[PDB]
Every structure is written in structure tokens, then in C-alpha cells.
Symmetry: D2
Subunit: 114 residues, 4 copies
Amino acid sequence: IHKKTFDIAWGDMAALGHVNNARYFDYFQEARIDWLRELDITGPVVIHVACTFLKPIVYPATVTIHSKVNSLGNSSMIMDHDLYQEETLMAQGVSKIVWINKSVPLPDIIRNLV
Amino acid sequence: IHKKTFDIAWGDMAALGHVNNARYFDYFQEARIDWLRELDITGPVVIHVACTFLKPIVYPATVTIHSKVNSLGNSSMIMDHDLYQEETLMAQGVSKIVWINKSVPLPDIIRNLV
Amino acid sequence: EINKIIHKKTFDIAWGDMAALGHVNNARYFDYFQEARIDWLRELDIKQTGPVVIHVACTFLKPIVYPATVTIHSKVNSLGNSSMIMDHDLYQEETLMAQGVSKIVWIDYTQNKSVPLPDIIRNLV
Amino acid sequence: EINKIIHKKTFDIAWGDMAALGHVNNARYFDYFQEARIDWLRELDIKQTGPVVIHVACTFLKPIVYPATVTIHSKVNSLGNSSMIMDHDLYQEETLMAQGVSKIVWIDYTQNKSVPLPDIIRNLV
């Protein structure tokens, strides 16, 4: 639903030779900001973030983050990021985003991302 | 069980004025490496990592990561990181670490961290 | 010959690149010059003996702000026996936001001994 | 007076600071000088008008490797009307791993106009 291609930086690599896991969260966050900026987004805050590391990534690489929403509970949402190197899936991201200091019903430009 | 005090860097702050969430994973990872280095640790790999963001952090700050293990299923472990600013809890980290490309029984210097 | 722009790299600023006071951290600029330089050496087919950075500098003429698409135009000069200098001009649109400089030396990595510059770089005279 | 070490900061290298080829990335050095400089200005009680970095440089004499405890000894010179220079020597143990330099200018932030240096810095003559 939202796609972002980009290249791994040589300095995103940690000493044992592949992307630091923490940079995966820099990647998912940029992807989230990008998408929200397209949508022209009282605000969200990330309450939770997680990654599952399937395959380690090496320089050089071109990768693509397929972002999608998967549940809206009013005032809350869950958002998935899938990180592909070529057709291979290298990691799964998942963020819980809330709207706000108290809970405001979900914007209506995302209710509509369905 | 493992404690690490340290100071937030001015450049760990993102534009809206408080620590980038992604740096929380730099913090938990260093804490994990530190501890494993004390323990003198075929190897682990992080398969999963997650954070829950309770309170945002601002410069300057002194914070402390209380790390502990919480389940060993042979060949797997779950490790918690709790990040305190003063006596206040600012976020909860949780990593799943596995030993290895196939599953080796858990080292015996961690079985012993009980 | 030398002081010509032999490399141009376009890209976008990550929202995380920004420091607290609302412009790009200045350490990150070096991350950008570092990427322009590595990409350029890949063109040339360069990647046990090889380049290391002995010095690097940057002058900050204008601050950069998210969102932003910048371009780095790289040129080279001062080739010595092992050494070479590489200037980077970082543009946003038509405006020059910063001028970088990085001195690179060729060594034997395992033996840390200075070693004469590759031929493919020498031919840029 | 000026060129004396007026600041010393001890710390440890993060395992993440290292770049692929097994020593500390060179952008991160600037993160260290940046922290030494901010800490020093906090001593002096410095934090709408204030310092910005116009230039920053570093010479890399020896590579740093994880694990490592380093010390940055900072000194100042070349005070001008708005400008000042600040040298950083980065030590591991008794060995000098890199020499940094950073030129700072005092401005009005909202108005980007050069402004005369604070008195508390001037008194270091």
C-alpha cells in the first residue's frame, strides 16, 4: 500500500558485516513519516514497535519497505512494514500508533486507508 | 540483574525535541553486548526486538537500563530491558535471542543466570 | 583532467538526520560524503590494500531542513604518491549548503604501510 | 589564558559506533566532539542568541576499536569578535588517536546575524 525503495548505507553496517538491527527501526520510522506526510498528517505517537529479523542484509543492497495498516480500533492503529531485498523478505516491522494527553478518535484520512 | 547508567547525547534527539525512538534500540543492544561481554560470550542472534514507549526523554538526562532474562526455553531466551529516568520508567525493551544454521542448546553460563 | 566534477550523487534527508534544533546534525554530513566517496570508488572498481581517510572537514554555509533533496558534486585534486584529496560541494536545488573535503591515503590494511596510488586514479591527470 | 585545556571528557565507545571494517566510523568522531563542546558550554552556563558551528575538521592518527575508553581534552583559541576556535585531542590511554577542530560563531538564531561573543568566553584571555 505504501512502498519505499532505497539503498543501504555503508555506515549502517555494524562490525560483524551486516546492517545493525537498530537501523531497521530508522528505516521503518522514515517509512512511516513519509507515508503520513503524503497523507498530510492532535497527533499520533508510537506506543510500541517491534521487528522480526528473518535474513541479515549486507552492503551493497537495494531494499523496499511495503507498509500497510492492519487494524484500526478507534483511536489506535497497527501498521506493518515488510522489508524486501529483491523478492526476498528480510524482516517484518510492526508499530502501534495512538492519537493524542488523551485519546482522540482516529483521523478520518486513515480510517479511510481501510 | 544487569544495570547500565549513561547519558543521553544531544544528537540522539530528533527534531520534535526528544530521544528518537530508534536510539532506544541502540541503547538496548549496547546493554545486551555489555552484559554478554561480561559473561564472556556458536552464538546468539536476535530474532525479535520490541519496545514500549511509556514516557519520552529529553536532554539532558541520565538513565539506567535494568536488564534481566525472563525465559529460557532451551535454545531460546527472552531478555527484558527496563529504561529508567531517575526512579521513573520511560520504556520497556524485550529481545528474543536464539543460539546457532541450526538450533544449539543454550549455553550453560546463561542457563545459570537463572 | 583532475578538478572536474567526476561524480554527482542525488538523495533525500532522513527525518532522523535532524538534530534537536531543527536542522541536519553535522556529523551526518560526513555520512553523506562518505557515501558519495564509496559510490565513486565502486565506479572505478575500487573497494588487502586500499583507501583510508586521514582527514576530513566541512564548512557549513546554510543549514539543511527536513524534507530536502540534496546533490553532492565531487571533484579530486592533489594526487600525491599514496595520497589524494577529494572536495565535495553539497547543493540543495541551486544553493550550496556546505563544502566538504576529504584526504584519502592508500595503504596495506594488514600492514599499515603506505603504498603507491592506484593507476586508474593517476590517469585522471 | 586561552590555549590551556579547559575541558576533559571521558567515555566509552558504543559497539554500534563501529563501521563495517572494524573501527569507529569517522562521522561519529564529530558526535564525540559535539558532546564535549556542548558539555563545556553547559559549565559556562551557555546553551535566542548563541553558538553555531561554521566548520569542523578531524585528523585521524590511529583507528579506534570496540571496546575502548577514550578521553577528549579541549582547548580554545582564535577568539574573534563573534568567532572562536576549539581544538579537541582524542586520547585512548596515553595515545593520541585523532585531533579535532571546530570553529564556532555566535549569532542571533531567529535573525541569522552575527553577534559579538559572550563575555564569559572573552575572559579566558
